A paper describes a structure:
To better understand the molecular interaction between pseudoalterin and PG, the crystal structure of pseudoalterin was determined to 1.9 Å. The sequence identity of pseudoalterin to the M23 peptidases LasA and lysostaphin is 54% and 15%, respectively. The catalytic domain of pseudoalterin, comprising five β-strands and four connecting loops (loop 1–loop 4), is quite similar to those of LasA and lysostaphin, with a root mean square deviation (RMSD) of 0.64 and 4.0 Å, respectively. Among them, either H79 or H118 can act as a general base/acid in PG hydrolysis based on sequence alignment of pseudoalterin with its homologs (LasA, LytM, lysostaphin, and ALE-1), and mutation of these two residues to alanine almost completely abolished pseudoalterin activity to PG. In the model of the pseudoalterin: (NAG–NAM)2 binary complex (NAG, N-acetylglucosamine; NAM, N-acetylmuramic acid), the glycan strand (NAG–NAM)2 interacts with the C-terminal domain. In addition, compared to LasA, the side chain of Q113 of loop 3 of pseudoalterin makes the S1 pocket much deeper, and may be capable of orienting the long side chain of amino acids.
(ii) Pseudoalterin can bind to the glycan strand of Gram-positive bacterial PG with its C-terminal domain and degrade the PG peptide with its catalytic domain. Pseudoalterin preferred to cleave the bonds with Gly/Ala at P1 and P1′ positions and, to a lesser extent, to the bonds with larger amino acids at these positions.
Author numbering: 1 to 173
């Protein structure tokens, strides 16, 4: 079917999102969002992350997994642990992929930086990161800001039913 994404948690629940940023946090495009459910810092009871859509798995490492849709769009999930699938496996929307890591070393098993447990979520097409601007997730339109991680709610927000949800506010599926 047509590529459609859902927020990687259950209907009627909320997590929190930061502002849109590139995969590295510098430069363009703003392809990525950091999601967390507010469980706390390192060592806390971090949640399981659901596949935003169906597709074929690529497992890059113990902390880095991707779901590639039949359309060639894909979502990438970084800072992960307890990964449940291997290369070539098929998953459905909602499938539990793993947890986002509750330990600092596991979260950064391929490098990067982190201030606390979260999943770094990235949209790709043809294996290349692509901008989240004007893309949709759980029927929210994503409006990217004017710099990496920009959380100004006049610049960055999720919009559904004509109402905005800002970064660092309950984002309900
Ligand atoms: Zn990130």
């Amino acid at each position: 079917a047509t590529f459609t994404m859902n927020l990687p948690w259950s209907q009627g629940y909320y997590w929190y999102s930061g502002g849109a940023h590139s995969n590295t946090g510098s430069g363009y495009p703003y392809s990525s969002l950091d999601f967390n459910n507010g469980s706390g810092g390192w060592g806390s009871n971090t949640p399981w992350v659901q596949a935003a859509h169906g597709g074929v798995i690529t497992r890059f490492s113990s902390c880095n997994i991707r779901v590639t849709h039949s359309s060639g769009f894909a979502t990438n999930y970084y800072h992960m642990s307890n990964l449940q699938y291997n290369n070539g496996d098929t998953v459905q929307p909602g499938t539990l992929l793993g947890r986002y890591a509750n330990s600092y070393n596991q979260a950064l098993c391929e490098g990067g930086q982190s201030s606390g447990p979260h999943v770094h979520f990235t949209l790709l097409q043809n294996g290349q990161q692509v901008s989240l601007h004007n893309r949709y997730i759980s029927n929210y339109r994503i409006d990217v800001g004017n710099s990496n991680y920009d959380s100004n709610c006049n610049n960055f927000y999720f919009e559904r039913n004509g109402r905005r949800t800002c970064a660092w506010r309950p984002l309900y599926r």
